[PDB]
Amino acid sequence: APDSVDYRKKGYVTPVKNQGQCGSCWAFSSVGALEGQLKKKTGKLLNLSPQNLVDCVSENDGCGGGYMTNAFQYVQKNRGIDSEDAYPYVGQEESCMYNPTGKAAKCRGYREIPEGNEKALKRAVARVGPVSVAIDASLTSFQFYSKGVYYDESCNSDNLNHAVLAVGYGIQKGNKHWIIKNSWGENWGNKGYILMARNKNNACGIANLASFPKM
Numbered sequence: 544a545p546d547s548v549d550y551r552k553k554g555y556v557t558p559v560k561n562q563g564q565c566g567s568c569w570a571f572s573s574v575g576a577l578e579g580q581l582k583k584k585t586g587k588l589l590n591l592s593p594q595n596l597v598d599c600v601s602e603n604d605g606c607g608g609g610y611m612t613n614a615f616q617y618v619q620k621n622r623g624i625d626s627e628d629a630y631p632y633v634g635q636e637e638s639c640m641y642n643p644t645g646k647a648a649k650c651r652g653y654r655e656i657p658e659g660n661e662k663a664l665k666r667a668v669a670r671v672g673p674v675s676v677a678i679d680a681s682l683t684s685f686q687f688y689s690k691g692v693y694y695d696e697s698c699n700s701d702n703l704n705h706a707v708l709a710v711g712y713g714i715q716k717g718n719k720h721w722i723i724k725n726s727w728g729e730n731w732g733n734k735g736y737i738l739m740a741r742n743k744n745n746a747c748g749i750a751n752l753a754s755f756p757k758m
């Protein structure tokens with residue numbers, strides 16, 4: 544093997560969830576980052592609560608959207624985030640029902656990756672683990688993706704609408720790629736994941752809004 548890393552084989556990635564009709568794609572991506580780190584330090588993985596983020600991160604719009612950096616900042620200020628079981632996901636805004644007794648993780652800040660620098664992203668995923676990214680998933684090609692390495696020259700790096708999680712990187716039929724985890728269920732794309740193009744001149748803005756929490 545050359546320069547390839549898949550955290551799935553490692554146990555840093557939890558099962559693929561489905562955001563539903565709520566636009567909490569930012570909360571799931573952040574949770575993904577947090578979870579990847581929780582394995583890195585604790586040696587044990589656990590499903591964190593995306594709802595907790597949705598209901599408590601006042602700086603975001605709940606099901607209307609939000610940024611990953613704001614979510615991390617919340618977990619730090621709040622000093623902890625509940626596990627899924629402790630604070631279940633219902634797919635809609637409601638009152639923040641944080642349960643201190645249910646805290647299962649915490650963090651001390653975050654570090655945004657250099658805007659538009661793919662290489663700094665490869666290292667971040669290689670040295671830290673799953674990274675929260677933001678891409679353009681408006682095109683139908685992306686939506687009906689099934690297999691192989693995605694790459695559509697119509698993708699717009701400036702229009703960042705869907706937030707996902709980079710679980711790693713690797714090669715395919717000569718095509719380098721970023722292993723992406725989406726929150727649309729195990730029934731979308733390749734069992735919930737998608738292989739997007741790497742080094743194709745920041746395809747879809749993969750490295751345009753990356754970040755990861757610090758433990």
Ligand SMILES: *[C@@](=O)([N][N]C(=O)[C]([C][C]([C])[C])[N]C(=O)O[C]C1=[C][C]=[C][C]=[C]1)[N][N]C(=O)C1=[C]C(O[C]C2=[C][C]=[C][C]=[C]2)=[C][C]=[C]1
Nearest residue numbers: 562563566567568569608609610677701703704705706727
């Ligand atoms: C998410 O649902 N909402 N995304 C965002 O709020 C993100 C936040 C991160 C920062 C990326 N985008 C964002 O804030 O954009 C700002 C920006 C732009 C340009 C430069 C810098 C910053 N994304 N949603 C979709 O792609 C989407 C999702 C659904 O979900 C429903 C569904 C769930 C399961 C199965 C099927 C469907 C619906 C419509 C669109």
